[PDB]
Amino acid sequence: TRPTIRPRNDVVHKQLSAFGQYVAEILPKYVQQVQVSCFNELEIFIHPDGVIPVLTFLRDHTNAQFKSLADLTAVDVPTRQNRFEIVYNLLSLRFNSRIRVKTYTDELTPIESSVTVYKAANWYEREIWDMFGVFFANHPDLRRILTDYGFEGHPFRKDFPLSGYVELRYDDEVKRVVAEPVELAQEFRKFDLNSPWEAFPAYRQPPE
Amino acid sequence: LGLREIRIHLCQRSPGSQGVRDFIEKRYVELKKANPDLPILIRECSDVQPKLWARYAFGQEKNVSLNNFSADQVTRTLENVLSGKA
Amino acid sequence: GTSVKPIFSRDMNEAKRRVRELYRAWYREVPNTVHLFQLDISVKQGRDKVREMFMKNAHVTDPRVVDLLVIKGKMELEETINVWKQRTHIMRFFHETEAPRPTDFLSKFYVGHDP
Amino acid sequence: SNIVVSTRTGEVMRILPRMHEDINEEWISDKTRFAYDGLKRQRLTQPMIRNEKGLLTYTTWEDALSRVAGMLQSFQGNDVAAIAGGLVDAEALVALKDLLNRVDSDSLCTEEVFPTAGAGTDLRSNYLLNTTIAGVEEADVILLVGTNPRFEAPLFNARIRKSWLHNDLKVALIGSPVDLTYRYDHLGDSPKILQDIASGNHPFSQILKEAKKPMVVLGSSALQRSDGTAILAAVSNIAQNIRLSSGVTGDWKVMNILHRIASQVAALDLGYKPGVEAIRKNPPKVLFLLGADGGCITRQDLPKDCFIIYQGHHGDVGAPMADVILPGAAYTEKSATYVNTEGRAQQTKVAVTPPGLAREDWKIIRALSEIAGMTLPYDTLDQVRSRLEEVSPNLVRYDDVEGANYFQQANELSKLVNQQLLADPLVPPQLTIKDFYMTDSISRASQTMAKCVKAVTEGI
Amino acid sequence: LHHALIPHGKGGRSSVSGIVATVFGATGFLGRYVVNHLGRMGSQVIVPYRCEPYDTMHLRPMGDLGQIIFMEWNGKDKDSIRKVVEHSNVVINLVGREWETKNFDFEDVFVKIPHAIAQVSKEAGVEKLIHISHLNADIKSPSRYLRSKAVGEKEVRAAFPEATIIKPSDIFGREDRFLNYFASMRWFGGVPLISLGKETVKQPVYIVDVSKGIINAIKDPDAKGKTFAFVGPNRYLLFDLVQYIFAVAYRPFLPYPLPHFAYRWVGRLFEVSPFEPWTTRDKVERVHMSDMTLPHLPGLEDLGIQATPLELKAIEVLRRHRTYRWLTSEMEDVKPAKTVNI
Amino acid sequence: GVRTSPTGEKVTHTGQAYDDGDYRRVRFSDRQKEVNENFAIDLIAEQPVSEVGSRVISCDGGGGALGHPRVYINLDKETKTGTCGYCGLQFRQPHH
Amino acid sequence: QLIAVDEKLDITTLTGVPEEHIKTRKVRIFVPARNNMQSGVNNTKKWKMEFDTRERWENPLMGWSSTADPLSNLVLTFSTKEDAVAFAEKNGWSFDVEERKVPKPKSKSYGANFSWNKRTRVSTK
Ligand SMILES: NC(=O)C1=CN([C@@H]2O[C@H](COP(=O)(O)OP(=O)(O)OC[C@H]3O[C@@H](n4cnc5c(N)ncnc54)[C@H](OP(=O)(O)O)[C@@H]3O)[C@@H](O)[C@H]2O)C=CC1
Ligand SMILES: [Zn+2]
Secondary structure (H helix, E strand, C coil): CCCCCCCCCHHHHHHHHHHHHHHHHHCCCCEEEEEEECCCEEEEEECHHHHHHHHHHHHHCCCCCCCEEEEEEEEECCCCCCCEEEEEEEEECCCCEEEEEEEEECCCCCECCCCCCCCCHHHHHHHHHHHHCCCECCCCCCCCCCCCCCCCCCCCCCCCCCCCCEEEEEECCCCEEEEEECCECCCCCCCCCCCCCCCCHHHCCCCC | CCEEEEEEEECCCCHHHHHHHHHHHHCHHHHHHHCCCCCEEEEECCCCCCEEEEEEHHHCEEEEECCCCCHHHHHHHHHHHHCCCC | CCCCCCCCCCCHHHHHHHHHHHHHHHHHHHHHHHHHCCCCCCHHHHHHHHHHHHHCCCCCCCHHHHHHHHHHHHHHHHHHHCCCCCHHHHHCCCCCCCCCCCCCHHHHHHHCCCC | CCEEEEECCCCEEEEEECCCCCCCCCCCCHHHHHHHHHHHCCECCCCEEECCCCCEEECCHHHHHHHHHHHHHHCCCCCEEEEECCCCCHHHHHHHHHHHHCCCCCEEEECCCCCCCCCCCCEHHHHCECCCCHHHHHCCEEEEECCCHHHHCHHHHHHHHHHHHHCCCEEEEECCCCCCCCCCEEEECCCHHHHHHHHCCCHHHHHHHHCCCEEEEEEHHHHCCCCHHHHHHHHHHHHHHHHHHCCCCCCCCCEEEECCCCCHHHHHHCCCCCCCHHHHHCCCCEEEEECCCCCCCCCCCCCCCCEEEEEECECCCCCCCCCEEEECCCHHHCCCEEECCCCCEEECCCCCCCCCCCCCHHHHHHHHHHHHCCCCCCCCHHHHHHHHHHHCHHHCCCCCCCCCCCHHHHHHHHCCCCCCCCCCCCCCCCCCHHHCCCCCHHHHCCHHHHHHHHHHHCCC | CCHHHCCECCCCCCCECCCEEEEECCCCHHHHHHHHHHHHCCCEEEEEECCCHHHHHHHHHHCCCCCEEEEECCCCCHHHHHHHHCCCCEEEECCCCCCCCCCCCHHHHHHHHHHHHHHHHHHHCCCEEEEECCCCCCCCCCCHHHHHHHHHHHHHHHHCCCCEEEEECCEECCCCCHHHHHHHHHHCCCEEEHHHHCCCEECCEEHHHHHHHHHHHHCCCCCCCCEEEECCCCCEEHHHHHHHHHHHHCCCCCEEECCHHHHHHHHHHHHCCCCCCCCCHHHHHHHCCCCCCCCCCCCHHHHCCCCCCCCCCCHHHHHHHCCCCCCCCCCCCCCCCCCCCC | CCEECCCCCEECCCCCCCCCCCHHHHHHCCCCCCCCCCCHHHHHHCCCCEECCCCEEEECCCCHHHCCCCEEEECCCCCCCEECCCCCCEEECCCC | CCCCCCCCCCCCCCCCCCCHHHHCCEEEEECCCCCCCCCCCCCCCCEEEEECCCCEEECCCCCCEEECCCCCCCCEEECCHHHHHHHHHHCCCEEEECCCCCCCCCCCCCHHHHCCCCCCCCCCC
């Protein structure tokens, strides 16, 4: 158990669980769930309406000063009714800690922009809109950031094909670069790598 | 003018096909002995509706709904289709 | 019911009003785009192309989808006004280098296995 | 049988069993597994016509289709005829039926004979395996007449062996004493025995009477011996005597017919006039060979200058005798409907696309109809399947085996004409394992089956 | 149909059109458009070049990997012609020089080379041969260019009976000599026109239309022995045509009449230069000659092509000749020229 | 041990060669065709047969860790030589 | 607050998919069959959505396999059949669904191998 296994830390687990309970008690109107992963990471699952309050609390409360927004991204899970899962990662320098906030949305429901809480979100939210299509309500300047001008669709979507739909080439007759339907000389070869035997019994799901 | 085939689609559990069922149970064999060269196909429908198809020469074909019909009604419309009426 | 929340428009009428505002903006901008980008098309060509792009999705009856479409239209208009787009991006609306795919059954049967 | 086609970079690499507890049950036969390499040989890839010297030369789709349309427009009525093959899908069958009906033609036939006397095609229970494959586990007595299930339906014979081993089935055979994998009771090979069993004198008849839930299976291979009507009548009489002496046990469906051709049941459900006798009695001037490689009709049974059109995927006996050749798709290259021997309709998926200029069969027929001027009302596969549902609605339920028993009417109508039997022993076409491998067009082009035949003939 | 030559794909860059084309003179004005249209569909193109390979660089992005093969050839050498067409199922001939040179007179360029190409293609089993001549090709023409064109067309027909022959008329495009040539005259400051250009009728045709016509003639089975006339939709007087050209370029138009002998003398003076001549007596003869009308020949409309009018694709050529002041002027503010149509 | 097609084109060890009417041969005009002349099948054929006095022998291709995975070959069959799956070397038990 | 939209969900205009790959594609919703070479059943737990196969040809150089459609490798995974149907419906695709094939429970008995009077007795071990 000693040499190759990552060692556990019980003290940080207890501290994170206690602080998660503290946060959940303080904000019962929005907090839906609290988790502490076994590698000592604290996650708080909230309602979409509580993005501005919760974050503000976590940025301003004396016992919880998360003045840094490390990351803000979305995860696409097609099988869920609310497709996209918005993730905020916050860092507290005063208490040397990290916390995660999660919420959900679908293709048409907007989410309040948190530029008033964190300036760093200004680009991050844009990126989400560029690659997932999640609209942020009161964003001061929301537009594509990473994709090409006049690029249709949102690439970081599970139903979006890897190679897209159009490809570019220079056409001499019109003397410019044109976009045409994609046609690969060699198709991407799909590999079925999943083993037919269960690997981890601890994550087995009930067969209903 | 020249009939070529008859197609009767009946569902085997719905109530609206009951009369049609009775027809096939009782007065089908006699009909087959009165038209030994006429293809009268008997097929099964999904729960939607019972129906009777009739195909004429050159691919023209017409259909009649048999929902909630009685056996007498079924045989009446059928003999109307075979005869030069309606 | 359905516990749905709007983006901008509460009903269909507000969505149509925003659509008409976007149409006015694009109609106004087309001549300036033709001049600045030094396009070889006429102003009438650009305007009827704008009309065609608007009518391409005229079957939408959901106010939220209409609002999102108007937002994307504003994004494209802002890209065109600020000359962030280039000539290639503008001409990509016209498909000038693409052979016209046939739409009838016989030509598709002759060409290949794709329906 | 349900299968999984494994393909790589647009090439069929192998065939594997796909589990279906009611049909094949994790197994496939050797022909199903190893004949796929015949799809790489002897393929028809381009349209071909006859040149000035009478030789077949490549041409375009427009040219061949225009020639066929010009020949089809000139002849209408009984002079146009069509024959369906053994590996033909329901979509192409219904398209050809509609196209020939547009010229007031009804001479649509199959290469396998089924008795048209009495009920014939009209009653679906007349030509099906009513007990179904999964039902064999519930019987205790089964009687096989004039068939060899081991080679005509290997998975059905495996099911019979499973029931014999676990449920203590009792099996009797009327025919040649072929080697089934289990032990059966050989009543003999004379057809006369059937009449004796239908009479009541025979010892076996008492066994059938005292055994609840019995099964009587008549192979289709015994319906092509010029007296299949009499054999079918005698077997139906046996089934009726069973159903009468013991009464109606409920829903058991004693009567059964076991097919060996994958396109036969769909054709019958479309009303396709089984048997090729209609062509022989009224020879046509335009023949539509739709994958017909049985050699049933040659150029000696047809008038001089008969225009023959062959549409298939392999170059076989039926190809070089034609005037126009239209390359179709194999079963691995189309999404198509095939109806089981129990009446269970199933659909294929596209593994790879047809090679060269080969096209989908119903697409070819529809394009020909458009060029000839009598365009058909469907352009999409969904529309063709809607037409199939119009013609026979059981062809669009893709796993349903349920049906209605009309045995009383068919038995009543089978009593009218009682044409005599003949004193020839019932001999199945599949007498020895060497005859099992090469049976259809795809098998005959396969090299693995040639190796198998050479191994089973001269073992060493 | 030689299975390796069966069409496949959606007709794109990586698709296979089952066409193997040898395009003689692909390094010119029409050749680049023909090669581009061939490479769009996924066809295999063999470019025989005699120039510096650098001068063929612009043809490299026109095709997919391995679909364009460059080979060196010599016009006077038959073995090179055999080498470059040995594997092609279609051969297009676009060889032609507008001026006479010290090593290749008009007879060499328009008669001997096309005849040799046709003969070697017939001997090599090439199925289709597309040849390009002039609409005004006449054996009695006062231009050696057109007389040579007519003679070479007759020789090609004699050597390759099933050859498709195409007769365009003053193709205009971005790299054309026709639109640019008139535009280039402004440097002198006076536009010299014989009889003020009031007795010359022109029917110019768009370059993309000609390339599409060649491509559609390749894929049309019933265009084997046929001869096509590729002309534009409108006919213009020379004076009005030059007026419209200068109006689109936004340049002052100062046309003056010049006698035929004086224009011939000026043409001769330009001809003496070692480098390609701005103009030549032959060019003077051809540019002041009315375009023939041939209602008995098929045209672009018989190949499914609607000819593009000059007024639609003239700004894309002449905008380069505008000054900075008028560089941004639109297309529909020139009031197109009057057409003498029938 | 290279052969030559009727068109004068070298045949590769995989056996591939363009048909007479194949247009793709145009890619070799004014150029050459890349062919490896050391055919592996003939090279492994000329190797002699090792005689060993055991019913089971082991082969690792030579060089220990620089060879292939070590495999064991059964030599009980008399009218045949044990052949390594990886190396292709042949082994046999003494007879006569 | 709540507009109470009474329309069927449809996002086809927002996804950026060309109409060729919306009105012509046919998706397949199924639980994949077990690989008959193995006995593990862990790959037959979740539903999958795939697209119909399109043309693949041989590219003239190197003989590689080329394709022209963009959805040839797209395979989506769903927990339930209803979820996959909802996704396909809201994305505008026409689908076919096949019900799950669960292997029926068997009746295994080791003693049956040595039956006194029944055919199940084995002749070898
Ligand atoms: N341009 C026009 O207005 C219309 C032209 N068409 C005809 O269509 C043909 C092509 O038209 P276009 O593209 O405009 O003319 P270009 O001058 O632009 O093309 C000439 C091509 O032919 C080659 N070529 C010329 N002379 C020789 C030679 N002696 N030996 C080998 N190759 C040679 C050139 O090679 P390189 O560049 O390396 O020297 C070049 O590739 C011509 O025959 C022309 O007469 C006729 C009606 C008018
Ligand atoms: Zn070794």
